[PDB]
Design a protein around this motif. Structure first.
Motif, PDB file in Angstrom:
ATOM      1  N   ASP A 180       0.819  -1.205   0.000  1.00 47.73           N
ATOM      2  CA  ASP A 180       0.000   0.000   0.000  1.00 47.73           C
ATOM      3  C   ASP A 180       0.856   1.259   0.000  1.00 47.73           C
ATOM      4  O   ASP A 180       0.426   2.297  -0.522  1.00 47.73           O
ATOM      5  N   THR A 181       2.045   1.198   0.602  1.00 47.99           N
ATOM      6  CA  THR A 181       2.968   2.328   0.535  1.00 47.99           C
ATOM      7  C   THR A 181       3.468   2.542  -0.889  1.00 47.99           C
ATOM      8  O   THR A 181       3.519   3.683  -1.369  1.00 47.99           O
ATOM      9  N   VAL A 182       3.829   1.461  -1.590  1.00 45.40           N
ATOM     10  CA  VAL A 182       4.243   1.607  -2.985  1.00 45.40           C
ATOM     11  C   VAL A 182       3.135   2.255  -3.807  1.00 45.40           C
ATOM     12  O   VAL A 182       3.386   3.174  -4.598  1.00 45.40           O
ATOM     13  N   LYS A 183       1.891   1.806  -3.620  1.00 40.51           N
ATOM     14  CA  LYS A 183       0.784   2.407  -4.357  1.00 40.51           C
ATOM     15  C   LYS A 183       0.646   3.889  -4.025  1.00 40.51           C
ATOM     16  O   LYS A 183       0.459   4.724  -4.922  1.00 40.51           O
ATOM     17  N   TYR A 184       0.722   4.236  -2.737  1.00 43.80           N
ATOM     18  CA  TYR A 184       0.617   5.639  -2.341  1.00 43.80           C
ATOM     19  C   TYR A 184       1.704   6.475  -3.011  1.00 43.80           C
ATOM     20  O   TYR A 184       1.438   7.567  -3.531  1.00 43.80           O
ATOM     21  N   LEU A 185       2.937   5.965  -3.019  1.00 43.69           N
ATOM     22  CA  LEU A 185       4.048   6.716  -3.595  1.00 43.69           C
ATOM     23  C   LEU A 185       3.902   6.848  -5.106  1.00 43.69           C
ATOM     24  O   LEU A 185       4.234   7.896  -5.682  1.00 43.69           O
TER      25      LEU A 185
END
Length: 188
Positions: A180-185
């Motif tokens: 989910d962090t990769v998606k946010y970034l």
């Protein structure tokens, strides 16, 4: 905020123009990379959440394993050129770290032969300037992000994932937080 610079990710002081959108670095000798791929399936779980039209790129590194480490970077270039990453990732990780049957360039080649890549096809790729270029590209990308260690993942040439700032209470929650962090970034 829920996502914070310094917590789940950090920001490169020298952003990399023209970098792949999502760029992972790994070594088949890295024990944490084995856990990430074979037990946590980080890459698969990141890919299932990437926005439309965003792809993951994964590059091998030379700095673990001496001669064999460099052979593995060249073999990974072969896998990328032939489009067989999904056929060789598990047997390369297991060959290096589980059975420890990969001790030479010939042993790496055996993994591809057993996976159904023809001998002539492997050897032609291994010796090709296309593969020489892919080795240089993996090396240049590591230099550009000033890589220190693996596993590592970078988004848009600007942000570096910081798993040690994530919740490791449960391994599956951790994997979720990472993806989910990769998606946010990727949407920043």
């Amino acid at each position: 905020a829920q996502y914070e610079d310094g917590k789940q990710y950090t920001t490169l002081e020298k952003p990399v123009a023209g970098a792949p959108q999502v760029l992972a670095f790994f070594s088949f000798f890295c024990p944490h990379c084995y856990q990430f791929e074979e037990v946590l399936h980080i890459s698969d779980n990141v890919k299932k959440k990437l926005p439309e039209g965003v792809k993951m790129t994964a590059y091998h590194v030379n700095f673990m394993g001496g001669d064999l480490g460099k052979d593995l970077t060249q073999a990974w270039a072969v896998a990328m050129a032939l489009g067989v990453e999904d056929k060789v990732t598990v047997p390369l990780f297991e060959g290096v770290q589980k059975t420890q049957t990969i001790r030479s360039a010939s042993d790496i080649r055996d993994v591809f032969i057993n996976a159904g890549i023809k001998g002539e096809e492997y050897d032609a790729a291994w010796n090709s300037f296309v593969v020489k270029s892919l080795v240089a590209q993996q090396e240049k990308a590591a230099a550009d992000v000033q890589l220190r260690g693996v596993p590592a993942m970078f988004v848009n040439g600007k942000y570096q994932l910081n798993p040690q700032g994530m919740d490791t209470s449960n391994m599956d929650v951790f994997v979720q937080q990472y993806a989910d962090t990769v998606k946010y970034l990727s949407e920043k």
